[PDB]
Amino acid sequence: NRDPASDQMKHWKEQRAAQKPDVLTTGGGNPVGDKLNSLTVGPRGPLLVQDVVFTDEMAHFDRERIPERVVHAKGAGAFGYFEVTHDITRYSKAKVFEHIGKRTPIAVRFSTVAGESGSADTVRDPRGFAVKFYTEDGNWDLVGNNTPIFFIRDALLFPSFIHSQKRNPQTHLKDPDMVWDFWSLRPESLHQVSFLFSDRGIPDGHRHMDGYGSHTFKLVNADGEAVYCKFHYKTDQGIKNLSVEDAARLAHEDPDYGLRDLFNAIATGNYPSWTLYIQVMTFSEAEIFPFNPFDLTKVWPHGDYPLIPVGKLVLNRNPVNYFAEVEQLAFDPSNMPPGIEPSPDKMLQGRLFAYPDTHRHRLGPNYLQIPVNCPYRARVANYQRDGPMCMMDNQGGAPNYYPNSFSAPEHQPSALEHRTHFSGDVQRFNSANDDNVTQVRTFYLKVLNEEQRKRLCENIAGHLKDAQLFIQKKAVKNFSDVHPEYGSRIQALLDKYNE
Amino acid sequence: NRDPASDQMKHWKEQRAAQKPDVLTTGGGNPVGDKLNSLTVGPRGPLLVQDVVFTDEMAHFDRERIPERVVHAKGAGAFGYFEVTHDITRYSKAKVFEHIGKRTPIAVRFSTVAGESGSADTVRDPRGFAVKFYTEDGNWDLVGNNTPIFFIRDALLFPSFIHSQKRNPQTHLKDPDMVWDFWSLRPESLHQVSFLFSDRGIPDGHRHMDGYGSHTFKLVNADGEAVYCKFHYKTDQGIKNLSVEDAARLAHEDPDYGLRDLFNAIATGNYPSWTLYIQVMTFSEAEIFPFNPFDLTKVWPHGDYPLIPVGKLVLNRNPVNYFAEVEQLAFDPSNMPPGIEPSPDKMLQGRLFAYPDTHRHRLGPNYLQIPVNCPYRARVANYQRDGPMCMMDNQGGAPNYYPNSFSAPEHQPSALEHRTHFSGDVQRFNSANDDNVTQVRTFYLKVLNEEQRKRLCENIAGHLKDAQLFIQKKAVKNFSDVHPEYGSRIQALLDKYNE
Amino acid sequence: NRDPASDQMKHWKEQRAAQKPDVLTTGGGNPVGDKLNSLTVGPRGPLLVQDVVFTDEMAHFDRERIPERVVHAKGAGAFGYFEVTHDITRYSKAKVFEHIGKRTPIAVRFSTVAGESGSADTVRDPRGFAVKFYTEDGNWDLVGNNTPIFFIRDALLFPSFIHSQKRNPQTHLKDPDMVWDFWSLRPESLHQVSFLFSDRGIPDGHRHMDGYGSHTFKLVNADGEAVYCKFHYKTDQGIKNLSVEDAARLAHEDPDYGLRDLFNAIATGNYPSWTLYIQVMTFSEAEIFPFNPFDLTKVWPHGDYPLIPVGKLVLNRNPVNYFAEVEQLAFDPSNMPPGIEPSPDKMLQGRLFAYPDTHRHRLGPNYLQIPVNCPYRARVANYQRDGPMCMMDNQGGAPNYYPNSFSAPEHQPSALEHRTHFSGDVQRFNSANDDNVTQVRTFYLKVLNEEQRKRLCENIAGHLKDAQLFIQKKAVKNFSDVHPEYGSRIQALLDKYNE
Amino acid sequence: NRDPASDQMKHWKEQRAAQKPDVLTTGGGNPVGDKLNSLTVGPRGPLLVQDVVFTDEMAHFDRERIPERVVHAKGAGAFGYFEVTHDITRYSKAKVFEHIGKRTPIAVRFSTVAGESGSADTVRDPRGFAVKFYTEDGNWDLVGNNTPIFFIRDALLFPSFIHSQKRNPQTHLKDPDMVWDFWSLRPESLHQVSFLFSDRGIPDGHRHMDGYGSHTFKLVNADGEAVYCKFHYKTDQGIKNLSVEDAARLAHEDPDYGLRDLFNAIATGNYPSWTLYIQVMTFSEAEIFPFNPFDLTKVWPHGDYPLIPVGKLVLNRNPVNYFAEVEQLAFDPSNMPPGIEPSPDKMLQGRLFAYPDTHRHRLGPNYLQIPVNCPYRARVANYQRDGPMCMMDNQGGAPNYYPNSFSAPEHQPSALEHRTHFSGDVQRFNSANDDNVTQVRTFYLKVLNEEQRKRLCENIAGHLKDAQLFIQKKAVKNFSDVHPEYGSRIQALLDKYNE
Numbered sequence A, B, C, D: 001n002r003d004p005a006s007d008q009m010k011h012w013k014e015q016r017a018a019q020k021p022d023v024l025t026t027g028g029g030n031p032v033g034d035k036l037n038s039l040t041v042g043p044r045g046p047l048l049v050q051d052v053v054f055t056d057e058m059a060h061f062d063r064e065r066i067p068e069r070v071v072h073a074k075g076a077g078a079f080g081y082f083e084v085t086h087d088i089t090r091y092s093k094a095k096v097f098e099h100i101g102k103r104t105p106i107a108v109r110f111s112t113v114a115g116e117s118g119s120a121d122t123v124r125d126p127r128g129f130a131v132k133f134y135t136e137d138g139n140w141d142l143v144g145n146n147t148p149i150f151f152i153r154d155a156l157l158f159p160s161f162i163h164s165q166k167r168n169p170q171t172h173l174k175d176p177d178m179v180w181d182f183w184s185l186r187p188e189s190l191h192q193v194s195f196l197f198s199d200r201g202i203p204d205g206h207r208h209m210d211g212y213g214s215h216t217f218k219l220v221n222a223d224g225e226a227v228y229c230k231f232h233y234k235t236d237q238g239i240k241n242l243s244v245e246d247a248a249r250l251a252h253e254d255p256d257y258g259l260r261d262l263f264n265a266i267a268t269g270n271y272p273s274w275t276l277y278i279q280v281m282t283f284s285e286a287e288i289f290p291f292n293p294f295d296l297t298k299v300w301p302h303g304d305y306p307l308i309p310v311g312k313l314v315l316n317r318n319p320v321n322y323f324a325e326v327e328q329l330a331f332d333p334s335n336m337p338p339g340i341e342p343s344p345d346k347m348l349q350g351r352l353f354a355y356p357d358t359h360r361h362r363l364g365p366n367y368l369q370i371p372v373n374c375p376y377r378a379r380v381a382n383y384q385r386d387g388p389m390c391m392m393d394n395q396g397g398a399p400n401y402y403p404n405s406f407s408a409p410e411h412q413p414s415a416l417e418h419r420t421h422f423s424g425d426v427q428r429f430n431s432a433n434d435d436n437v438t439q440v441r442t443f444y445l446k447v448l449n450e451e452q453r454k455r456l457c458e459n460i461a462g463h464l465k466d467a468q469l470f471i472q473k474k475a476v477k478n479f480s481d482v483h484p485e486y487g488s489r490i491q492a493l494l495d496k497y498n499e
Ligand SMILES: NC(=O)C1=CN([C@@H]2O[C@H](COP(=O)(O)OP(=O)(O)OC[C@H]3O[C@@H](n4cnc5c(N)ncnc54)[C@H](OP(=O)(O)O)[C@@H]3O)[C@@H](O)[C@H]2O)C=CC1
Pocket: B148, B195, B198, B199, B200, B210, B234, B299, B300, B301, B302, B303, B304, B438, B439, B440, B442, B443, B447
């Protein structure tokens, strides 16, 4: 036989062999006499408006598409559960962590970053690894990537960074001058550029890469004590990457390699899992951390901040309809239940605004009423009403203003955010020169071996060669500031390429 | 005590008196600690982006409004049932008429025409009387008015007519020159203008007016024989109208008089009902009818085409949430189950397009998935997929192309439309001169008495007086063509006014 | 003759008498042969889809409506200029104030608050008085009201307040229980409630009321020195109000009284004007102001903070198309040029978010490209691209990422915000008990005389009478806390009303 | 040096040398002091709502995307002119054809069919070749393909056909069972399937393929006489195709090969051109044509219906902004000036509805006001008003109802559509069995040579091999019905593949 993905229709038919086919209806539920021949005046005559079967079906077809995600457009999804394996209730009172063996349903979407909906899975790019936990205190969206860090440390640069990675506004072509002009002018990118052009730039599908929250978050316990944390979810399938050569072959041979691989793994009962850990940094430690502990271009060294196990993420269920359950999935970093809070990370702060904002546009004002986005293990009760495509009962006749004397929903003071002190001017403070090289040097020298340093420099030179010489020169200077051999290896490869 | 409408919240609280208030949440289901004070840095400090309670609630508030209906914006709704009382199965095989005693859930919306969402109920205007039948063969929308006729008999004049009835595009004021310029240039309007300015121009709320399909429709029986029909649903509460003086007082005293009256009637168990009748005209009779039987400016005389009783419409349930159940209600004349079809009425033919079209704009592509619009007593099964705000399962993994060898839904040949012959050139046939006066003379002389003729002429003159003299002159000439006394009575009143 | 508003079409025709009528076209510019008769198969046959004249026109008709404003839906607009008369360059470096005699084009929209698009102009409610200044440093939107204060002092209460003032979510009726339950539970409302139920609750059209910024704002001069300020624009036509009785008569006689009065004033050359003043409070004075100087329920007494004259607002031009130039007008309090900045006022801080947010929904992502919203006296140049209904050239082939080495637009350090210092915990500071009565007592005792105190209490009692006794009791107690006679006068009137 | 496309930013910068960079502004035109650092309280403090620079830019970024085209998503565009070279005045009075030498501006978009926005250019698929003519009689959209025929001949099958060619609704994978189940059940597809799997299935970019109107159209001359026509626009660059092997290499090496090739051709002055021809069939010839002359699965043999030259299409101008000028381009087959009309082709009749319908969704109600879509060589004048994102003046104060006595636009009777007679029952006439094989046999035996018959069958077998055996069997039977050797050659290749 073929793979289970190929046999989707075959299996759908088999599952139904015991049933008569449904009656074909209009959207309004009126049975259709003939959906293959249009209503005309004679066999060689024009089409009538009173063919409302045609108009009903064609008008829906005309409206099938919604905007793709502004980033991470190309993706795959599955469903399963999170199970607590260890007690971290001393750090977080979040209900999702409440007792060992406690299970919370999850939804997950894996993605590339720059490519549009029709692009190939097996390309050099970060990977999105977004986890929605359907908790009794509402949804917790851990909107992670397959890297602990990012290219920039201020949200104001994010639209510019994404523009530089996508298409030239005139030609609609990928543009290496855009890519390398931005990175060469913004050397904070050196850390994530080094990770991206390493072997992990192209994981072997979604099951063989790690996930990370990337940002510093804040955990609050039942006593109102707070620590800073990082989330790490390590693949139980083990790290595995595709060679540049294999990735380029799969790019045209199977552009949907990651989709197919994840579906087949789950369909054959080979359920992928990840182990969720935290690192914990005290408020005192944050004060003496040698960098900004909220800088998204920095990791917390495992030596000083060991991984503490929490639980297991398991994907054991495929989507039944990809559009309804995956394309319409919305992850909001601002969805955090009590016990989990943001840090001052300037990037995370921007994300608190951007996700719900783009969801209201891409899906619609009432996107949280789409079933996969619904906090279906919490009771939603508030003073919000109306908006387009308003489903369920819109909270019925319940008093719609707060406060009221009519016993409508009440706030719960135990859910109040933890209180941190700040002092300072309202100002745009510069983060451009917050050490761009130190952790990058340790990655290059200590984390990588000789063989992977060589590939790293070939991968960089193989892309950078197409940028103008002034951009090549400025980029090489930044790599030299990490380590003189980093820069000179790339320069040697550029000299060979520039003939 | 006050009326039941006034005691809505009082009763909501009483119905719950044994229960504590629910927990106030974000749209994401996260409990909120304090929904009355914003998150700031210090008590006189700036508002933080990390106040996602504020942004979640304010962003939904910012999105509450949808476009109002392009016409019939101001309305009231209720629900109940249709019950078959007589057997008309010899005319129509429609399952809604299948056996005496058969009950089908209905939704009804009543409305004015020209006024926007904040306008007054008790003004001179036609009234919408739209009935949605949720049948096993899907929804049947009988999109009726409180008049058997309309001002025009071609859909191409509809936008112009509504423009003329609306606001001046520069001043945003009601414009008597626009109203009377259009009516004076389009004398087919004389019949409905006569009805509009009669006593029934301002019914005493919604319970005291008749409903009509207005259009000729087609009924098809189990043998594939067809007749033409009209739908009449006469108020069991009796015709009652408001005087111009009472209407003007209620306009400012209670702009929502019709809303309040319908809600209080149902809340006190005084359920309003209507008796549904048809008139039947054979294809042969349509050939010799002395007018175009599909001309919306013409009635079928009761003498020649007697009312045949069918059943009862009863409204026994108030909306629980007006936005979700009434503002979002969508009636499509194109929603007709087998046994009911359109006639060639040029106006009805235009309506087959316009309603689903405006609904996809006003509500969204997936507006048939809004609960009140959903054909919840039929099984929707087809090859339509996706679109924004896709709810349900989007028909799961079902094969999405027709035809297919995988047992997805099949067309049902018994639902094929009745097949009519027409012969003629495809062209734009002029209908402007299809007798604009004969049935209007009968209305003026036989349907009205002396007292009603006097008020009719005072009502017309009272509005027409504000139009330019050239428009007055040519409106009066049209009334003179109906009957010399019709014109001269109006001219006498205009002379007094133009004093 | 009639008023100039009535003669809109008459004047349009006369102005063109020297010209031939334009050729009637489809939206695509195709000339139309007959736009009065639909394309059918025979004179009594069905409508063809190849009637693309019908579909083109009907589809546009079906999409005419956009969401009305969530508040201030009912309005009137006009255009003119702002002229500097006095030098305030020692307080603000804003180019709009740069030299005496300097003129800046303005757009203004006047509005009620609670009523929808079809509601009456002459009702008790605050009035919007929004001014757009098209400056060389971009648009400055001074989104003011006819009151220096508001009902609440934290934006989290705004959606609840507006809900309380609009329709019951079940009945769709105005609901005195909702209005007075909210106000009685939120006594910070006493100051603006007292103003609202005074004579100024119903101004005689838009030309006879004052405008105010309401909020404290910040002014910054060329030396980087800052002061706090209030904006006052006082009617040069003088304060004039409508009696409750006259307002109720105009409500049904001319629901568009304000629209008509403004249009006719400008059309006859009777151009209304306002004098713009500031009050100035130093950072030192802000420290010792006996209340929160950023509390929207408080005024700055004229005795301590005198009005300083700035210039004149003149409206000398009527809209030509109301939908394009008034309905689509978008005012954003966040539109402030260099020299004008927000204060920490919690209400103003919320408004910085809400207006552009609601505009992106009501109008569309590219609403700043609508001509009346366009900053047409500034050069818009940035790294923003695309979005629906993208006009002009979308900034052509300009580099779309910042920073860049390709000479695309550059930030300008002179435009950097003034540096204010804040210190404190991040928390939800309760402002509910920030003195609700002291300035209200001064209003009741000093600003009103005996005759005005009597009407005030009759106006309040006449509405509050319809609320439940427990709500009446709680509301009266709040009025008693202002002054024992305030409460007892209202209670005496309620006793008479409650029979 | 590099190709002109690579040097887009280099050239933009060079063209601006000797100008200072523009000032970076918000969308409201306010200059920005620093767009690289967010506004916080202290350097490691929280993000403020008062950072309206961040919100203005981020909210626009969040709204960049619009729905991609439901088909033909992946495309390239350019601009130029149409020049009349021959006189066809005797067939069509259309102004665009009026005089030899006469030039009309055009816009063109080339595309694949099934692939999404990020898919590869060099894949086996039909190609779109859409031409917009900006004529004095409004826009003429000739919405063609690189084939004279299509897979189906009734619009009711079009959504199903497209579904079958796109992604499995559960797995989101291309599905050979869906592709071949549809084609095997619908043998009318054989003609276009044979063309698709021939060498012309993968043209060498957009300059080396033909365009066709595909449909029969109607031409009407100044005497009101009509003929039927086909449009052919043949490449002046000559037919050139990519081998399967080269196409697969470019698919990963340059997914935007077609984009780059077109841009570089125009940028270097190598302007591509096509010769526009018509075929003419009289109404008499249409009566005796051996097939349905309106059947989209059939051609008119050149022998019986010779190509008559009309003019030249020349592309001499690249887009300056791809999103504004190409992504936003909207072609409506219903955009036809007088002298050009639809035929009764059931497929064309469907397209008259579908294009403006999907445009109102994808772009918005007022999409004809987007500059590239605007009929800028006609004066648009009608009774249409308002809608979202209304630009220009919305036709100012012009009377907005027809007819009127106020000199607003008038219909032009010379533009009336030509009147055709049709007779028959209004019914759903089955076209499924209208000869599926005869023209396919001629293509297979006479048009192709031995070498290309071999590749045709290898290309088909190479894809068909992945469908289930029952689908392979049914598809081969249809190929056998064309010609026994067609079927048996494919069967032999399937046997080798199926091992
Ligand atoms: N046939 C119809 O449905 C209607 C007919 N007409 C008039 O009747 C004439 C044809 O005679 P025919 O139909 O036999 O009528 P009939 O002579 O049989 O009876 C007259 C009927 O007109 C309706 N009517 C009463 N007052 C009004 C009013 N103010 N506005 C509108 N309708 C009213 C009533 O039926 P009811 O209201 O129950 O329909 C009434 O019984 C036409 O010229 C037409 O103007 C007018 C309205 C309805």
